[PDB]
Design a protein around this motif. Structure first.
Motif, PDB file in Angstrom:
ATOM      1  N   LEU A  16     -36.414 -28.547 -28.963  1.00  0.00           N
ATOM      2  CA  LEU A  16     -36.211 -29.922 -29.504  1.00  0.00           C
ATOM      3  C   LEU A  16     -36.573 -29.945 -30.997  1.00  0.00           C
ATOM      4  N   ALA A  17     -37.639 -29.252 -31.413  1.00  0.00           N
ATOM      5  CA  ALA A  17     -38.025 -29.100 -32.837  1.00  0.00           C
ATOM      6  C   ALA A  17     -36.912 -28.349 -33.580  1.00  0.00           C
ATOM      7  N   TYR A  18     -36.472 -27.218 -33.023  1.00  0.00           N
ATOM      8  CA  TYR A  18     -35.486 -26.311 -33.663  1.00  0.00           C
ATOM      9  C   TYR A  18     -34.185 -27.077 -33.966  1.00  0.00           C
ATOM     10  N   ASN A  19     -33.744 -27.920 -33.027  1.00  0.00           N
ATOM     11  CA  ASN A  19     -32.420 -28.599 -33.033  1.00  0.00           C
ATOM     12  C   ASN A  19     -32.505 -30.043 -33.555  1.00  0.00           C
ATOM     13  N   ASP A  20     -33.630 -30.425 -34.155  1.00  0.00           N
ATOM     14  CA  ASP A  20     -33.813 -31.754 -34.803  1.00  0.00           C
ATOM     15  C   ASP A  20     -33.119 -31.751 -36.173  1.00  0.00           C
ATOM     16  N   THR A  21     -31.788 -31.883 -36.213  1.00  0.00           N
ATOM     17  CA  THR A  21     -30.985 -31.561 -37.423  1.00  0.00           C
ATOM     18  C   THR A  21     -30.041 -32.705 -37.820  1.00  0.00           C
ATOM     19  N   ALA A  22     -30.051 -33.845 -37.120  1.00  0.00           N
ATOM     20  CA  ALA A  22     -29.145 -34.987 -37.403  1.00  0.00           C
ATOM     21  C   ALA A  22     -29.366 -35.485 -38.840  1.00  0.00           C
ATOM     22  N   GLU A  23     -28.280 -35.635 -39.602  1.00  0.00           N
ATOM     23  CA  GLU A  23     -28.318 -36.071 -41.022  1.00  0.00           C
ATOM     24  C   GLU A  23     -27.031 -36.834 -41.339  1.00  0.00           C
ATOM     25  N   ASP A  24     -27.177 -38.072 -41.810  1.00  0.00           N
ATOM     26  CA  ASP A  24     -26.067 -38.898 -42.348  1.00  0.00           C
ATOM     27  C   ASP A  24     -25.920 -38.551 -43.827  1.00  0.00           C
ATOM     28  N   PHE A  25     -24.701 -38.286 -44.285  1.00  0.00           N
ATOM     29  CA  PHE A  25     -24.422 -37.954 -45.700  1.00  0.00           C
ATOM     30  C   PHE A  25     -23.722 -39.124 -46.365  1.00  0.00           C
ATOM     31  N   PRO A  26     -23.992 -39.364 -47.665  1.00  0.00           N
ATOM     32  CA  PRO A  26     -23.553 -40.588 -48.329  1.00  0.00           C
ATOM     33  C   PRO A  26     -22.033 -40.680 -48.481  1.00  0.00           C
ATOM     34  N   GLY A  27     -21.521 -41.905 -48.352  1.00  0.00           N
ATOM     35  CA  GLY A  27     -20.390 -42.416 -49.148  1.00  0.00           C
ATOM     36  C   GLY A  27     -19.045 -41.847 -48.719  1.00  0.00           C
ATOM     37  N   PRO A  28     -18.085 -41.683 -49.659  1.00  0.00           N
ATOM     38  CA  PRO A  28     -16.705 -41.393 -49.296  1.00  0.00           C
ATOM     39  C   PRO A  28     -16.532 -40.050 -48.568  1.00  0.00           C
ATOM     40  N   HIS A  29     -15.417 -39.954 -47.829  1.00  0.00           N
ATOM     41  CA  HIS A  29     -14.909 -38.764 -47.092  1.00  0.00           C
ATOM     42  C   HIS A  29     -14.523 -37.663 -48.092  1.00  0.00           C
TER      43      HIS A  29
ATOM     44  N   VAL B 202     -37.895 -17.298 -32.137  1.00  0.00           N
ATOM     45  CA  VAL B 202     -39.194 -16.670 -32.508  1.00  0.00           C
ATOM     46  C   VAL B 202     -39.919 -17.572 -33.509  1.00  0.00           C
ATOM     47  N   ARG B 203     -41.230 -17.372 -33.627  1.00  0.00           N
ATOM     48  CA  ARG B 203     -42.069 -17.953 -34.701  1.00  0.00           C
ATOM     49  C   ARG B 203     -41.946 -17.036 -35.915  1.00  0.00           C
ATOM     50  N   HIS B 204     -41.532 -17.588 -37.054  1.00  0.00           N
ATOM     51  CA  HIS B 204     -41.501 -16.897 -38.368  1.00  0.00           C
ATOM     52  C   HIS B 204     -42.191 -17.799 -39.395  1.00  0.00           C
ATOM     53  N   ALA B 205     -43.282 -17.323 -40.000  1.00  0.00           N
ATOM     54  CA  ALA B 205     -44.102 -18.049 -40.998  1.00  0.00           C
ATOM     55  C   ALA B 205     -44.398 -19.475 -40.510  1.00  0.00           C
ATOM     56  N   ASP B 206     -44.871 -19.614 -39.266  1.00  0.00           N
ATOM     57  CA  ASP B 206     -45.321 -20.890 -38.642  1.00  0.00           C
ATOM     58  C   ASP B 206     -44.157 -21.882 -38.526  1.00  0.00           C
ATOM     59  N   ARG B 207     -42.938 -21.401 -38.264  1.00  0.00           N
ATOM     60  CA  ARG B 207     -41.761 -22.270 -37.986  1.00  0.00           C
ATOM     61  C   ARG B 207     -40.839 -21.551 -36.995  1.00  0.00           C
ATOM     62  N   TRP B 208     -40.116 -22.306 -36.165  1.00  0.00           N
ATOM     63  CA  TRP B 208     -39.153 -21.747 -35.183  1.00  0.00           C
ATOM     64  C   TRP B 208     -37.910 -21.257 -35.932  1.00  0.00           C
ATOM     65  N   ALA B 209     -37.389 -20.091 -35.554  1.00  0.00           N
ATOM     66  CA  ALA B 209     -36.205 -19.461 -36.181  1.00  0.00           C
ATOM     67  C   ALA B 209     -35.479 -18.628 -35.132  1.00  0.00           C
ATOM     68  N   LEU B 210     -34.151 -18.553 -35.212  1.00  0.00           N
ATOM     69  CA  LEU B 210     -33.357 -17.616 -34.379  1.00  0.00           C
ATOM     70  C   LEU B 210     -33.374 -16.240 -35.051  1.00  0.00           C
ATOM     71  N   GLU B 211     -33.503 -15.204 -34.224  1.00  0.00           N
ATOM     72  CA  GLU B 211     -33.450 -13.775 -34.611  1.00  0.00           C
ATOM     73  C   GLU B 211     -32.264 -13.151 -33.881  1.00  0.00           C
ATOM     74  N   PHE B 212     -31.264 -12.672 -34.621  1.00  0.00           N
ATOM     75  CA  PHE B 212     -30.050 -12.041 -34.048  1.00  0.00           C
ATOM     76  C   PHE B 212     -30.473 -10.782 -33.284  1.00  0.00           C
ATOM     77  N   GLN B 213     -29.854 -10.521 -32.126  1.00  0.00           N
ATOM     78  CA  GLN B 213     -30.211  -9.386 -31.227  1.00  0.00           C
ATOM     79  C   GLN B 213     -28.981  -8.541 -30.866  1.00  0.00           C
ATOM     80  N   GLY B 214     -27.797  -8.873 -31.386  1.00  0.00           N
ATOM     81  CA  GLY B 214     -26.561  -8.109 -31.148  1.00  0.00           C
ATOM     82  C   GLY B 214     -25.498  -8.961 -30.489  1.00  0.00           C
ATOM     83  N   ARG B 215     -24.525  -8.313 -29.854  1.00  0.00           N
ATOM     84  CA  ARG B 215     -23.349  -8.972 -29.228  1.00  0.00           C
ATOM     85  C   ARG B 215     -23.345  -8.656 -27.731  1.00  0.00           C
TER      86      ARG B 215
END
Ligand SMILES: Nc1ncnc2c1ncn2[C@@H]1O[C@H](COP(=O)(O)CP(=O)(O)OP(=O)(O)O)[C@@H](O)[C@H]1O
Length: 409
Positions: free
Chosen positions: A16-29, A395-408
């Motif tokens: 829920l912390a990691y995905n808290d990303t909602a942002e309204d951007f100003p003004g015209p399209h 993973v925890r990186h410098a006291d914040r949540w981050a995704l670490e790529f692990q392959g395909r």
């Protein structure tokens, strides 16, 4: 039932912390902001291509001629129009003109086999009008009146896995453009280098932010790119402020800089991604490149509008894998196991992407069905998800949540 069912509250909280990303951007399209810039900064250089430089006034007049031509040939809003992807001025008039006509562009490498071009035109439903005449020398005309529609398709770009046409609409492109401009402080006097050809979507991340701010789009010439030492010299000479690089290409630049330490005083941002790389490489970069330039490590497929996650790369670290970081504005990412359950922090799963970045789908209804799915990830939150085929863990990186790529897969 929900994907987070088996997660404990602390494990659920990390996501829920990691995905808290909602942002309204100003003004015209997006297109309205591009039009506003052209009218407020008409004299500024808008594109510096291999065959010369266009002001905003000239770029928009050339684009207007393209839109008028398309309308005169009966190409209606919501059509797909092929553009010849070269390093010259003409494709910039073509692709802007296609957008002003209320249409979507499909970039075509004019050096591709004719059989592959034929497939792209048929699969995209695209007119070849701008492949068969020089879009830059069309009769002058104002852009016709296009009735406002929300989330018009902006481009169809072919990506492989077998070519699939990714259908990308305006809300995704607008969202990406706001992020590039705000995250990297793009200003009118900036010079955004375009390394990727127009057939590769990092070009989108350079072109629209330039034109949405009054900055100049500077096409990187083919002959410069393949010569790392010349590329470093060219970046200095052209005073480039922002650059797109694929990881492997940047590795070539790092080796050249180790051989001959470079000064890049005007460079502020390198947006790098495509492959895993290491703090040992980025540490070396910062010792042999005399520049204020910061590395923004990014991850994302074409299917989620160029980039999905970003990590500001610390210059002082010299050990370990660089994480892919946190979601862009209005993106949410989930690592899911084989049964579609949300993995705990530290557990590797397949990346599924939600949010404003998602393609409408592919041209192929079959390919769309297999790639895009709906899932209740958390109680109350049903997500449209794109399955990436990529693996990562939270993973925890410098006291914040981050995704670490692990392959395909
Ligand atoms: N920072 C990163 N670290 C690791 N892998 C990354 C990455 N950024 C992107 N990728 C990989 O690259 C994929 C995205 O590829 P795209 O950007 O769509 C170009 P492509 O599909 O590889 O080539 P094509 O479009 O020319 O066919 C991701 O799904 C992932 O596998």
């Amino acid at each position: 039932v929900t994907a987070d069912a088996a997660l404990e509250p602390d494990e659920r909280a990390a996501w829920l912390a990691y995905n808290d990303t909602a942002e309204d951007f100003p003004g015209p399209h997006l297109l309205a902001r591009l039009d506003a810039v052209a009218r407020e900064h008409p004299d500024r250089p808008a594109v510096h291509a291999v065959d010369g430089v266009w002001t905003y006034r000239e770029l928009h007049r050339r684009a207007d001629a393209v839109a008028a031509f398309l309308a005169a040939r009966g190409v209606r809003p919501g059509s797909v129009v092929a553009i010849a992807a070269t390093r010259a001025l003409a494709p910039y008039a073509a692709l802007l003109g296609v957008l002003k006509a209320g249409c979507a562009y499909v970039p075509v490498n004019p050096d591709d086999p004719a059989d592959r071009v034929a497939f792209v035109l048929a699969d995209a439903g695209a007119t070849p009008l701008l492949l068969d005449t020089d879009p830059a020398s069309l009769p002058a005309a104002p852009a016709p009146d296009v009735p406002h529609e929300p989330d018009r398709v902006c481009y169809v770009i072919y990506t492989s896995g077998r070519p699939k046409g990714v259908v990308m609409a305006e809300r995704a492109v607008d969202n990406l453009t706001h992020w590039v401009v705000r995250r990297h402080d793009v200003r009118p006097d900036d010079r955004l280098g375009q390394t990727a050809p127009l057939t590769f979507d990092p070009s989108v991340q350079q072109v629209f932010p330039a034109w949405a701010t009054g900055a100049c789009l500077v096409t990187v010439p083919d002959d410069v790119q393949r010569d790392p030492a010349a590329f470093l010299d060219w970046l200095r000479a052209e005073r480039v402020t922002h650059l797109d690089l694929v990881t492997s290409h940047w590795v070539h630049l790092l080796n050249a800089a180790e051989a001959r330490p470079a000064e890049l005083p005007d460079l502020r941002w390198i947006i790098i991604g495509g492959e895993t790389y290491y703090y040992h490489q980025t540490h070396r970069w910062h010792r042999v490149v005399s520049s204020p330039a910061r590395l923004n490590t990014i991850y994302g497929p074409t299917e989620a509008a160029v980039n999905a996650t970003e990590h500001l790369t610390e210059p002082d670290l010299d050990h370990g894998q660089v994480p892919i970081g946190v979601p862009l504005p209005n993106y949410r990412l989930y690592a899911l196991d084989d049964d579609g359950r949300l993995c705990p922090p530290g557990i590797t799963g397949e990346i599924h992407i939600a949010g404003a970045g998602l393609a409408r789908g592919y041209r192929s209804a079959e390919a769309t069905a297999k790639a895009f799915h709906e899932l209740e990830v958390h109680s109350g939150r049903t997500e449209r998800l794109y399955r990436t085929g990529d693996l990562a863990r939270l993973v925890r990186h410098a006291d914040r949540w981050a995704l670490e790529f692990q392959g395909r897969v």
